[PDB]
Design a protein around this ligand. Sequence first.
Ligand SMILES: [Cu+2]
Length: 98
Amino acid sequence: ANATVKMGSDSGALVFEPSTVTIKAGEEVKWVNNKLSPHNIVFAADGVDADTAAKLSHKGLAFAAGESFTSTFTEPGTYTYYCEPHRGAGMVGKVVVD
Ligand SMILES: [Cu+2]
């Protein structure tokens, strides 16, 4: 089963929910653009390789509530991601693979 997260809380708050999700080795995650546009979802090559992290790093630029993105986690790690330009707050989230 893939996991999914929505870019900002229903009510209209920055914080991602669920902030962490679990996913399998080679399963997907989908991010759905809710609200508080523009979003990016930039992934840090923190304890994971550059290429992998880069492919997983959505440099994509979601404003329209509709354009979701997907990423595959081939390697069983933890990935951490953040939203650079998105005004200060601390858009923390991280995915955990099985
Ligand atoms: Cu954001």
